[PDB]
Each structure stands twice: as C-alpha cells, then as structure tokens.
Scaffold this active site. Sequence first.
Site, PDB file in Angstrom:
ATOM      1  N   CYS A   1      -7.921  -2.420  -4.871  1.00 49.12           N
ATOM      2  CA  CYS A   1      -6.944  -2.714  -3.839  1.00 49.12           C
ATOM      3  C   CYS A   1      -7.704  -2.514  -2.541  1.00 49.12           C
ATOM      4  O   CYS A   1      -8.814  -3.040  -2.424  1.00 49.12           O
ATOM      5  CB  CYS A   1      -5.697  -1.855  -3.986  1.00 49.12           C
ATOM      6  SG  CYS A   1      -6.080  -0.203  -4.493  1.00 49.12           S
ATOM      7  N   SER A   2      -7.170  -1.779  -1.565  1.00 46.05           N
ATOM      8  CA  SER A   2      -8.012  -1.485  -0.405  1.00 46.05           C
ATOM      9  C   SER A   2      -8.967  -0.325  -0.690  1.00 46.05           C
ATOM     10  O   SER A   2     -10.176  -0.452  -0.504  1.00 46.05           O
ATOM     11  CB  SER A   2      -7.162  -1.168   0.837  1.00 46.05           C
ATOM     12  OG  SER A   2      -7.993  -1.215   1.994  1.00 46.05           O
ATOM     13  N   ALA A   3      -8.433   0.822  -1.118  1.00 48.41           N
ATOM     14  CA  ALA A   3      -9.252   1.984  -1.464  1.00 48.41           C
ATOM     15  C   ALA A   3      -9.723   1.978  -2.920  1.00 48.41           C
ATOM     16  O   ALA A   3     -10.701   2.678  -3.262  1.00 48.41           O
ATOM     17  CB  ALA A   3      -8.456   3.273  -1.187  1.00 48.41           C
ATOM     18  N   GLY A   4      -9.057   1.206  -3.780  1.00 47.49           N
ATOM     19  CA  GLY A   4      -9.361   1.224  -5.200  1.00 47.49           C
ATOM     20  C   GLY A   4      -8.948   2.494  -5.922  1.00 47.49           C
ATOM     21  O   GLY A   4      -9.600   2.883  -6.896  1.00 47.49           O
ATOM     22  N   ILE A   5      -7.856   3.136  -5.506  1.00 54.61           N
ATOM     23  CA  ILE A   5      -7.402   4.305  -6.262  1.00 54.61           C
ATOM     24  C   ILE A   5      -5.897   4.298  -6.535  1.00 54.61           C
ATOM     25  O   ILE A   5      -5.460   4.745  -7.603  1.00 54.61           O
ATOM     26  CB  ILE A   5      -7.817   5.620  -5.562  1.00 54.61           C
ATOM     27  CG1 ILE A   5      -7.317   5.682  -4.113  1.00 54.61           C
ATOM     28  CG2 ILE A   5      -9.346   5.810  -5.611  1.00 54.61           C
ATOM     29  CD1 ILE A   5      -7.557   7.078  -3.447  1.00 54.61           C
ATOM     30  N   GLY A   6      -5.087   3.831  -5.581  1.00 57.25           N
ATOM     31  CA  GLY A   6      -3.636   3.969  -5.700  1.00 57.25           C
ATOM     32  C   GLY A   6      -2.963   2.928  -6.578  1.00 57.25           C
ATOM     33  O   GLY A   6      -2.490   3.231  -7.685  1.00 57.25           O
ATOM     34  N   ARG A   7      -2.884   1.694  -6.073  1.00 61.53           N
ATOM     35  CA  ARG A   7      -2.416   0.587  -6.902  1.00 61.53           C
ATOM     36  C   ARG A   7      -3.354   0.360  -8.086  1.00 61.53           C
ATOM     37  O   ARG A   7      -2.901   0.180  -9.225  1.00 61.53           O
ATOM     38  CB  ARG A   7      -2.271  -0.674  -6.032  1.00 61.53           C
ATOM     39  CG  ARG A   7      -1.094  -0.523  -5.045  1.00 61.53           C
ATOM     40  CD  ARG A   7      -1.067  -1.546  -3.906  1.00 61.53           C
ATOM     41  NE  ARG A   7      -2.122  -1.290  -2.922  1.00 61.53           N
ATOM     42  CZ  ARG A   7      -2.312  -2.011  -1.818  1.00 61.53           C
ATOM     43  NH1 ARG A   7      -1.506  -3.044  -1.544  1.00 61.53           N
ATOM     44  NH2 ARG A   7      -3.311  -1.702  -0.991  1.00 61.53           N
ATOM     45  N   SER A   8      -4.668   0.421  -7.839  1.00 66.89           N
ATOM     46  CA  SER A   8      -5.657   0.293  -8.909  1.00 66.89           C
ATOM     47  C   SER A   8      -5.422   1.329 -10.000  1.00 66.89           C
ATOM     48  O   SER A   8      -5.475   1.011 -11.195  1.00 66.89           O
ATOM     49  CB  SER A   8      -7.066   0.427  -8.325  1.00 66.89           C
ATOM     50  OG  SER A   8      -7.281  -0.567  -7.319  1.00 66.89           O
TER      51      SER A   8
ATOM     52  N   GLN B   1      -1.674   7.503  -5.819  1.00 67.00           N
ATOM     53  CA  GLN B   1      -1.701   8.198  -4.535  1.00 67.00           C
ATOM     54  C   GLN B   1      -0.370   8.824  -4.120  1.00 67.00           C
ATOM     55  O   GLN B   1      -0.364   9.591  -3.157  1.00 67.00           O
ATOM     56  CB  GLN B   1      -2.158   7.247  -3.434  1.00 67.00           C
ATOM     57  CG  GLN B   1      -3.659   7.070  -3.325  1.00 67.00           C
ATOM     58  CD  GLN B   1      -4.008   6.005  -2.304  1.00 67.00           C
ATOM     59  OE1 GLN B   1      -3.478   4.892  -2.357  1.00 67.00           O
ATOM     60  NE2 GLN B   1      -4.887   6.339  -1.361  1.00 67.00           N
TER      61      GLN B   1
ATOM     62  N   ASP C   1       0.834  -1.196   0.000  1.00 73.34           N
ATOM     63  CA  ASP C   1       0.000   0.000   0.000  1.00 73.34           C
ATOM     64  C   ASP C   1       0.871   1.249   0.000  1.00 73.34           C
ATOM     65  O   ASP C   1       1.889   1.315   0.692  1.00 73.34           O
ATOM     66  CB  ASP C   1      -0.920  -0.017   1.225  1.00 73.34           C
ATOM     67  CG  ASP C   1      -2.195   0.809   1.029  1.00 73.34           C
ATOM     68  OD1 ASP C   1      -2.394   1.392  -0.065  1.00 73.34           O
ATOM     69  OD2 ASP C   1      -3.005   0.865   1.986  1.00 73.34           O
TER      70      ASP C   1
HETATM   71  O1  VO4 Z   1      -5.625   0.128  -1.577  1.00 70.56           O
HETATM   72  V1  VO4 Z   1      -5.001   1.516  -2.718  1.00 70.56           V
HETATM   73  O2  VO4 Z   1      -4.406   2.722  -1.323  1.00 70.56           O
HETATM   74  O3  VO4 Z   1      -3.396   1.265  -3.692  1.00 70.56           O
HETATM   75  O4  VO4 Z   1      -6.220   2.636  -3.628  1.00 70.56           O
END
Ligand code: VO4
EC number: 3.1.3.48
Length: 297
Positions: free
Chosen positions: A214-221, A261, A180
């Site tokens: 991913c967890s939030a669906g913005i960074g890795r996604s 992110q 993350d």
């Molecule tokens: O679970 V992520 O912080 O890469 O959107």
Amino acid sequence: EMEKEFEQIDKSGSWAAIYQDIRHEASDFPCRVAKLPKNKNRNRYRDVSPFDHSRIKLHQEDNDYINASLIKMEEAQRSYILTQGPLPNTCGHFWEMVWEQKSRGVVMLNRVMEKGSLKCAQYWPQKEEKEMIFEDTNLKLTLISEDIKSYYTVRQLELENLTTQETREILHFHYTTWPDFGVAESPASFLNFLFKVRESGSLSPEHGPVVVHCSAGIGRSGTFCLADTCLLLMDKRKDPSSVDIKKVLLEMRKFRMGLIQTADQLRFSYLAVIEGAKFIMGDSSVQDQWKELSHED
Ligand code: VO4
C-alpha cells in the site's frame, strides 16, 4: 470458534486492548541496513523499515537495499513480499525485485493520491502506447490490458529484461476504495477481490511470492495477507477452529513490523476470515454472493 471469540471481544468492547497486546508481544528485530545513511532516500517512512533478516535483497552490486520484506508462512506454505509504495527513485528497484523474485502478481491496496497527498509513485504505465523504461535497472514495462471494475482494476503488464530480452506477464491487482488506516467497504467486497487475486494464479507455488503493497506496506497489506493465510490454513485442515488469528498475525510480525495498523483493521480481519470460512467449508455459492454484494459492474 473464532466467531465466538469475535463476539466476546465485541461484547467487551476490547478490540483496542487486544490490538495493543499484539503490539506489545510483536517481535523486535534490527533494521540496520534500512537505517544506513545511504538508504535514507529509499525509505518512504522513517518509522517503517524491513528487518534485516527478512529483507529482500536486490541482485545488484551497487546497493541491494529496497524497503521490502519476505513473509514466509511455513505452515500455510505461502510466501508474500510486503513493500512500501515505490518512490520516484525506487521504481526501477521495485521492478527489479519483481523480476529477480519471479513474482507473477502485484497487489496494490492504495491510490497514488490519498487524502490530498501523494502516497506512491506512478510506477506502471497508464496507456498502452506509452511504455516505461527504468534505465537504472534495464527493465521495460508495457501496459497490455486493463479491466476496470467499480472498486478495483486488474491490469495485464509485460515486464521485459532489456539485458536478456526475456519477457514476463505480470498481473496488477489495484484495490481503489480502501482508505489508509481504514477498512474495505465490506467483507464481501474484500473477499471478492482476494479471490480474484487467487483465481489469477498469482499466489501459486510455481511462481515467486506475490508482491503486496500500500503506501507503507504494513496496514492494508497486513490485513490482506493475514486474511489470506488464515483462510489457507483453514482450507489445509478443513478445521476453522485450529486457526488462531492473533497467533498468525504475530508470526507474520516476525517478518515485517507493524502488520495491521489499527484495532478496526484487526476486527475487519476477523470478519473477513469468518465470512470467507463459509466458502472454505463447502459453500461455493457465497463467492457469487460476494460478487453481487460488491457491485463491481
Ligand atoms: O499504506 V498502509 O498505511 O495500509 O501500510
């Protein structure tokens, strides 16, 4: 060309400046439905919500809200659904979304537990003999097979509409070594995984949009989708120089807030696209080179 831009930003040490510019230019659209009091327990993060105009709506009369956005890349002619890691009470909604949107692949870029905290519900079965039934949405999910590699796992799942008894095969692509707010171990390792998703058919236009989370669906996604769309655009015109990564990211940010992110994730996105361009521009041997460099066995 993107390569020379990359070198200019590295020599200037201005990745943070570039990334904050993207943040300031990014679209700002309302998320009124996500913020309704009745939806509070459907959002994993107070500060990560789908825009109203692009949110996926569930086909139920009760409450059609799910924290998920449709990213429609018109020019590249690829769509993705980006969503958060399902919550204990939204795993039924998640698989309902997969069913109604006719997705063939789910790309998961996080682990259920990361940094000592639970980032995602265990929303798919870990054992063939223990299927899952999501009673609220009348769906049954069975693990059919699993192919564990060193840093990712591919699962074949059977999703059944218990109401109609129709079944569907869903492929699950689980990247297990991407931290993350971090980057994948190498471009080669990331590209090897992306091309594994591509080779499954999960991104084909005969199917619904791939689901990416991913967890939030913005960074890795966001990193995953940005690299993919950039490579697809290059492929379309065989013209690496016509692809402006920052503009593709801002276009993607019209459909979902916060894609990429950190400045290091943006920088990684450049690397992945620059390296993947070797394959797109005629050098099919780099794919084998990536698989070797990734050490997936
Ligand atoms: O679970 V992520 O912080 O890469 O959107």
